[PDB]
Amino acid sequence: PTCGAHEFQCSTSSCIPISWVCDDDADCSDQSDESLEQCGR
Amino acid sequence: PTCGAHEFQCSTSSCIPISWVCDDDADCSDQSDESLEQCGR
Amino acid sequence: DLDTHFTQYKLARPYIADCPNCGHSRCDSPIAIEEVRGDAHAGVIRIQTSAMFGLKTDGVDLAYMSFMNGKTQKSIKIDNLHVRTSAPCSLVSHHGYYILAQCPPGDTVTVGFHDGPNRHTCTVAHKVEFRPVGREKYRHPPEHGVELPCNRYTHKRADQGHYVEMHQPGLVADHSLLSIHSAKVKITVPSGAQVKYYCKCPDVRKGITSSDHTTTCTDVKQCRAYLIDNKKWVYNSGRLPRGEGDTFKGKLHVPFVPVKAKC
Amino acid sequence: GLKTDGVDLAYMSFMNGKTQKSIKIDNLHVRTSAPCSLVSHHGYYILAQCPPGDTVTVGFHDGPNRHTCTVAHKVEFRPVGREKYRHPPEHGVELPCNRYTHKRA
Amino acid sequence: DLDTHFTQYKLARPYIADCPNCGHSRCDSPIAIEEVRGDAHAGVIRIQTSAMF
Amino acid sequence: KAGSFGDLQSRTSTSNDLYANTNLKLQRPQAGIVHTPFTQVPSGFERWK
Amino acid sequence: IATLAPEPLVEHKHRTLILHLHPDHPTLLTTRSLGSDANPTRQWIERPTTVN
Amino acid sequence: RTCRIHEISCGAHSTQCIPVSWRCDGENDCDSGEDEENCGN
Amino acid sequence: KYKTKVPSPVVKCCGATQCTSKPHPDYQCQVFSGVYPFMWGGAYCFCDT
Ligand SMILES: [Ca+2]
Ligand SMILES: [Ca+2]
Ligand SMILES: [Ca+2]
C-alpha cells in the first residue's frame, strides 16, 4: 500500500505527513518517525 | 481651594492630611506628595 | 521537524495588554488571558495568552519562554509555569501563544510564571465546567469504563487547517525615552526606532524622527512620545490599538485543534 | 513591617519562646479553599482577597519550618446589585459598595 | 523500640505499578494509589501507595 | 430568534455565507483602558443541547 | 463593578408584553404598574424562560 | 500671512503658518477646521 | 456555537473617526468620544477630554 506524495508511511498501512516526522512525537505505533535512521540522533 | 492647617493640597481641589505625605503610597493622581522634590529622595 | 510548525511563530513577538486582577488592581501584565475555550468532554481546556512559549531569540527550545518588560523582549527558562482554576491543574503542552491544561471545574482561570523574585499573575473570570460523556454524571474520568466517542483538544501541534491572523503592531507609547537635556527636552531613539512625537507647548510640533532631535520646548509633561517597531508582528488583540494605514492579513496556525477521540 | 530595629515592609517579627525573632517575608500564604492573593500587611493585620470557603489559614516559613494555623470561619462572596455573580467582571456597571481600605492610616 | 515496628518491613521493597493520570496519559509510576480509606470522623484518611517511607 | 436554535445558520459546514443574529451590542470602555467590551445573549445551540 | 445582563427580547401583543430572557447568572426581574394598585411581582431568573 | 513658499497659512484668523504636508491628517491642528478639508480622494 | 472575534480598535484621539458598513454577519460599529486611555508607559495621547 502506497500513500500520497505528502505522507510518510511508517508500517501497517498507516501514514503520517512529511511535516510530522522528526519532531519528538509518537505519530505512529512503531515509532519509525523518530528512529535513528531518519533523524540521526 | 484653600484647605486647613492639617491638610496638604496636591492639585485641583484634592486635600489629604500631612501624615499621608511621603509614605510610599500615591493618594493623588498628580502624585505630588510622593514626588522627587517634595519627598527629597 | 520542530521548525516546520515554528516557522511563522518565529515572525511574531509577545506583547503587554490589559489583564483584570493581575495583582489586586488590574495592572498591565506580560501574560494576559484572552479567549479560554472550555467545551471539551474531559475538562481539558486551551488557554491563549500574550507570552510566547517554546521560542528563544535564536532557534526553538521547549523549556524556554519569551516575554516583554517594556520594549525589551526578554527570554527566560520555564521553571514554575502554573495554571489553576480552583485546584492546581496539570498542563499538557504549550506552543506559541497557547497553553493546554486539564482543569477541575470552577469560576476563575489563573496563570503565572516566576523569573526571579517576580510573580506575574493574571486572573480572568471564565466559568469552566466538567462535561461527562454518556448517561452518567461522573466527576472525574475513571480507571475502567466503557469507551465512547468524545471530542477533545489534540495533544499535537500542527497546521490542521485552522488559522489565526497576525498584524503589524501599532504605535506603542513610551514615556521613559523623553528626558530633559539641559533645559530643553531630548528624544532618545535606540537602534532605528523611528520615534514619533507630538508637542503642544506653544503650538503643534508633530513629526517623525530617527535619531537625536533635541526638542526646543521646556516641560516633559506637555509632549507625548511613541515608538514604531515593525520588525515583528502581533496577533490583533482587542486590547491593543490598531495601526494607521492598511495592515496585512497574516496567517498563523492554531496548534491544539479540536479532534474526536475515545473517552 | 517591623524588624525590631526600625520600619521595613519586607520584614516580619515573631517569638519562638522568650526570644523575639525577626526574619524576612519569604512565603506568606493565605488560603481559604484556593490560595488567596494578599494585598497589604501592617502590624497585627493582613488584608487579602479570598475565594469563598469554610476555613481560613495563614502561614510563614521561618527556616525549614512551616508554622501554619487553620481557623474555622465561614467566608462568603457578596455581590453588589441585582445579579449574583461569582467573580467580579471586567466590564459592567459601577455601583457603590463597602470594602476594607488599601491604605494604612 | 522503633526497630520493632520495622522487622518485617526490611524484607519488603517498593514497586512500579500503573496508575491513571500522572500527567495526562496514565503512566507507570513508583507512586501508585491503592485502597484509599476514608471512614473516619474528621476527614482524616489513610492512603496506601507503592513507595516506602 | 437569537436564543433557541437558529442563532447561527450555515448552508454547509464549509460554506461562506452565514446567518447570525446574537443581539451583539457594543459597550463603552471605562476608566481609560484600551479594550473592547460587548454584551450578547448566549448561544441557543448550547442551550438546545 | 457589577455585571450587566443580556438584553431581553420584547414581543408585543394586544395588552400583553412577552419577554424572552436568557441570563448567565441568577438575575432578578421586578415589575409594577403605574395605576392605583401597582400589583408588584418579583422573581429570580436562573434558566432561560419566558414571561407574559 | 506672507510666509515662505514651502509653507501655507491656515485659518486666516490668527495668521498661523503650517507646512503643506499636514493635509487631511485627522488631527484638528488650527483653531479653524479648514486644514482637514479639500484633501485628495 | 459561534465565536465572536474583535479586531483591534483604532485610537485616533485628536479628532473623530467614522466607519463604513462592511459585509459581515452581525457586524457592529460605534464611536465613543473622550475616553483618554492609559497604556503601559503613560497615557496614550495628549488631547484631553
Ligand atoms: Ca512525529
Ligand atoms: Ca501618600
Ligand atoms: Ca493637518
PDB file of N, CA and C in Angstrom, chain B:
ATOM      1  N   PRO B   1      -9.240  76.678  46.308  1.00  0.00           N
ATOM      2  CA  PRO B   1      -9.380  75.577  47.267  1.00  0.00           C
ATOM      3  C   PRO B   1      -8.325  75.620  48.369  1.00  0.00           C
ATOM      4  N   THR B   2      -8.518  76.505  49.343  1.00  0.00           N
ATOM      5  CA  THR B   2      -7.594  76.650  50.463  1.00  0.00           C
ATOM      6  C   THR B   2      -8.030  75.708  51.579  1.00  0.00           C
ATOM      7  N   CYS B   3      -7.202  74.709  51.870  1.00  0.00           N
ATOM      8  CA  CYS B   3      -7.500  73.756  52.923  1.00  0.00           C
ATOM      9  C   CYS B   3      -6.907  74.231  54.247  1.00  0.00           C
ATOM     10  N   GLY B   4      -7.163  73.470  55.307  1.00  0.00           N
ATOM     11  CA  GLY B   4      -6.787  73.864  56.647  1.00  0.00           C
ATOM     12  C   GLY B   4      -5.309  73.671  56.934  1.00  0.00           C
ATOM     13  N   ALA B   5      -4.975  73.794  58.219  1.00  0.00           N
ATOM     14  CA  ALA B   5      -3.591  73.706  58.666  1.00  0.00           C
ATOM     15  C   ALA B   5      -3.094  72.273  58.806  1.00  0.00           C
ATOM     16  N   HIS B   6      -3.985  71.284  58.771  1.00  0.00           N
ATOM     17  CA  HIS B   6      -3.600  69.884  58.892  1.00  0.00           C
ATOM     18  C   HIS B   6      -3.839  69.094  57.609  1.00  0.00           C
ATOM     19  N   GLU B   7      -4.078  69.769  56.486  1.00  0.00           N
ATOM     20  CA  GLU B   7      -4.345  69.114  55.214  1.00  0.00           C
ATOM     21  C   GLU B   7      -3.360  69.610  54.166  1.00  0.00           C
ATOM     22  N   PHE B   8      -2.901  68.699  53.313  1.00  0.00           N
ATOM     23  CA  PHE B   8      -1.993  69.019  52.218  1.00  0.00           C
ATOM     24  C   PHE B   8      -2.741  68.912  50.899  1.00  0.00           C
ATOM     25  N   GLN B   9      -2.621  69.940  50.064  1.00  0.00           N
ATOM     26  CA  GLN B   9      -3.337  70.018  48.798  1.00  0.00           C
ATOM     27  C   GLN B   9      -2.407  69.611  47.660  1.00  0.00           C
ATOM     28  N   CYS B  10      -2.826  68.621  46.868  1.00  0.00           N
ATOM     29  CA  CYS B  10      -1.972  68.131  45.784  1.00  0.00           C
ATOM     30  C   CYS B  10      -2.064  69.039  44.561  1.00  0.00           C
ATOM     31  N   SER B  11      -3.237  69.064  43.921  1.00  0.00           N
ATOM     32  CA  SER B  11      -3.567  69.903  42.776  1.00  0.00           C
ATOM     33  C   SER B  11      -5.055  69.768  42.493  1.00  0.00           C
ATOM     34  N   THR B  12      -5.689  70.898  42.156  1.00  0.00           N
ATOM     35  CA  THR B  12      -7.079  70.989  41.678  1.00  0.00           C
ATOM     36  C   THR B  12      -8.078  70.367  42.660  1.00  0.00           C
ATOM     37  N   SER B  13      -8.113  70.947  43.866  1.00  0.00           N
ATOM     38  CA  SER B  13      -9.050  70.607  44.946  1.00  0.00           C
ATOM     39  C   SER B  13      -8.953  69.132  45.348  1.00  0.00           C
ATOM     40  N   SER B  14      -7.778  68.760  45.851  1.00  0.00           N
ATOM     41  CA  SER B  14      -7.530  67.410  46.352  1.00  0.00           C
ATOM     42  C   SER B  14      -6.686  67.535  47.612  1.00  0.00           C
ATOM     43  N   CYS B  15      -7.305  67.334  48.773  1.00  0.00           N
ATOM     44  CA  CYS B  15      -6.651  67.543  50.055  1.00  0.00           C
ATOM     45  C   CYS B  15      -6.521  66.226  50.807  1.00  0.00           C
ATOM     46  N   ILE B  16      -5.330  65.978  51.344  1.00  0.00           N
ATOM     47  CA  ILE B  16      -5.037  64.803  52.159  1.00  0.00           C
ATOM     48  C   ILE B  16      -4.287  65.289  53.397  1.00  0.00           C
ATOM     49  N   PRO B  17      -4.327  64.570  54.521  1.00  0.00           N
ATOM     50  CA  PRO B  17      -3.597  65.021  55.714  1.00  0.00           C
ATOM     51  C   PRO B  17      -2.084  64.963  55.541  1.00  0.00           C
ATOM     52  N   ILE B  18      -1.394  65.655  56.458  1.00  0.00           N
ATOM     53  CA  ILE B  18       0.060  65.784  56.392  1.00  0.00           C
ATOM     54  C   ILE B  18       0.746  64.454  56.678  1.00  0.00           C
ATOM     55  N   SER B  19       0.098  63.573  57.444  1.00  0.00           N
ATOM     56  CA  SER B  19       0.655  62.250  57.700  1.00  0.00           C
ATOM     57  C   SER B  19       0.618  61.352  56.469  1.00  0.00           C
ATOM     58  N   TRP B  20      -0.154  61.717  55.447  1.00  0.00           N
ATOM     59  CA  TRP B  20      -0.244  60.955  54.213  1.00  0.00           C
ATOM     60  C   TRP B  20       0.790  61.391  53.181  1.00  0.00           C
ATOM     61  N   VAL B  21       1.689  62.303  53.542  1.00  0.00           N
ATOM     62  CA  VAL B  21       2.704  62.829  52.633  1.00  0.00           C
ATOM     63  C   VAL B  21       4.002  62.066  52.857  1.00  0.00           C
ATOM     64  N   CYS B  22       4.589  61.570  51.760  1.00  0.00           N
ATOM     65  CA  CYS B  22       5.833  60.789  51.744  1.00  0.00           C
ATOM     66  C   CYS B  22       5.734  59.540  52.622  1.00  0.00           C
ATOM     67  N   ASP B  23       4.818  58.646  52.243  1.00  0.00           N
ATOM     68  CA  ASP B  23       4.630  57.408  52.988  1.00  0.00           C
ATOM     69  C   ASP B  23       4.485  56.203  52.062  1.00  0.00           C
ATOM     70  N   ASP B  24       5.150  56.251  50.896  1.00  0.00           N
ATOM     71  CA  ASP B  24       5.204  55.161  49.907  1.00  0.00           C
ATOM     72  C   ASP B  24       3.815  54.737  49.427  1.00  0.00           C
ATOM     73  N   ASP B  25       2.944  55.717  49.203  1.00  0.00           N
ATOM     74  CA  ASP B  25       1.600  55.457  48.704  1.00  0.00           C
ATOM     75  C   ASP B  25       1.120  56.684  47.949  1.00  0.00           C
ATOM     76  N   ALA B  26       0.589  56.473  46.749  1.00  0.00           N
ATOM     77  CA  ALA B  26       0.111  57.568  45.908  1.00  0.00           C
ATOM     78  C   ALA B  26      -1.360  57.811  46.220  1.00  0.00           C
ATOM     79  N   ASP B  27      -1.639  58.865  46.981  1.00  0.00           N
ATOM     80  CA  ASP B  27      -3.007  59.245  47.303  1.00  0.00           C
ATOM     81  C   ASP B  27      -3.577  60.282  46.345  1.00  0.00           C
ATOM     82  N   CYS B  28      -2.782  60.762  45.393  1.00  0.00           N
ATOM     83  CA  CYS B  28      -3.223  61.758  44.430  1.00  0.00           C
ATOM     84  C   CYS B  28      -2.845  61.311  43.027  1.00  0.00           C
ATOM     85  N   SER B  29      -3.685  61.676  42.055  1.00  0.00           N
ATOM     86  CA  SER B  29      -3.353  61.421  40.660  1.00  0.00           C
ATOM     87  C   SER B  29      -2.251  62.342  40.160  1.00  0.00           C
ATOM     88  N   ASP B  30      -2.056  63.493  40.812  1.00  0.00           N
ATOM     89  CA  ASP B  30      -0.920  64.349  40.495  1.00  0.00           C
ATOM     90  C   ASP B  30       0.389  63.740  40.978  1.00  0.00           C
ATOM     91  N   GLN B  31       0.320  62.892  42.018  1.00  0.00           N
ATOM     92  CA  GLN B  31       1.470  62.230  42.656  1.00  0.00           C
ATOM     93  C   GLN B  31       2.501  63.241  43.160  1.00  0.00           C
ATOM     94  N   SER B  32       2.015  64.385  43.644  1.00  0.00           N
ATOM     95  CA  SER B  32       2.902  65.426  44.148  1.00  0.00           C
ATOM     96  C   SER B  32       3.430  65.109  45.539  1.00  0.00           C
ATOM     97  N   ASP B  33       2.663  64.369  46.345  1.00  0.00           N
ATOM     98  CA  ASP B  33       3.080  64.065  47.707  1.00  0.00           C
ATOM     99  C   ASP B  33       4.219  63.054  47.761  1.00  0.00           C
ATOM    100  N   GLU B  34       4.412  62.269  46.702  1.00  0.00           N
ATOM    101  CA  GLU B  34       5.499  61.301  46.622  1.00  0.00           C
ATOM    102  C   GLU B  34       6.424  61.604  45.451  1.00  0.00           C
ATOM    103  N   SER B  35       6.601  62.884  45.134  1.00  0.00           N
ATOM    104  CA  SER B  35       7.422  63.282  44.003  1.00  0.00           C
ATOM    105  C   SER B  35       8.901  63.271  44.386  1.00  0.00           C
ATOM    106  N   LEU B  36       9.753  63.614  43.417  1.00  0.00           N
ATOM    107  CA  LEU B  36      11.191  63.631  43.661  1.00  0.00           C
ATOM    108  C   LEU B  36      11.613  64.838  44.488  1.00  0.00           C
ATOM    109  N   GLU B  37      10.914  65.963  44.346  1.00  0.00           N
ATOM    110  CA  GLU B  37      11.296  67.190  45.036  1.00  0.00           C
ATOM    111  C   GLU B  37      10.623  67.335  46.397  1.00  0.00           C
ATOM    112  N   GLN B  38       9.346  66.952  46.508  1.00  0.00           N
ATOM    113  CA  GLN B  38       8.631  67.104  47.774  1.00  0.00           C
ATOM    114  C   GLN B  38       9.131  66.117  48.818  1.00  0.00           C
ATOM    115  N   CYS B  39       9.418  64.883  48.409  1.00  0.00           N
ATOM    116  CA  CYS B  39       9.926  63.892  49.349  1.00  0.00           C
ATOM    117  C   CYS B  39      11.394  64.115  49.680  1.00  0.00           C
ATOM    118  N   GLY B  40      12.161  64.683  48.751  1.00  0.00           N
ATOM    119  CA  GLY B  40      13.583  64.856  48.942  1.00  0.00           C
ATOM    120  C   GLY B  40      14.426  63.642  48.617  1.00  0.00           C
ATOM    121  N   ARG B  41      13.818  62.558  48.143  1.00  0.00           N
ATOM    122  CA  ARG B  41      14.561  61.361  47.769  1.00  0.00           C
ATOM    123  C   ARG B  41      14.828  61.347  46.269  1.00  0.00           C
TER     124      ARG B  41
END
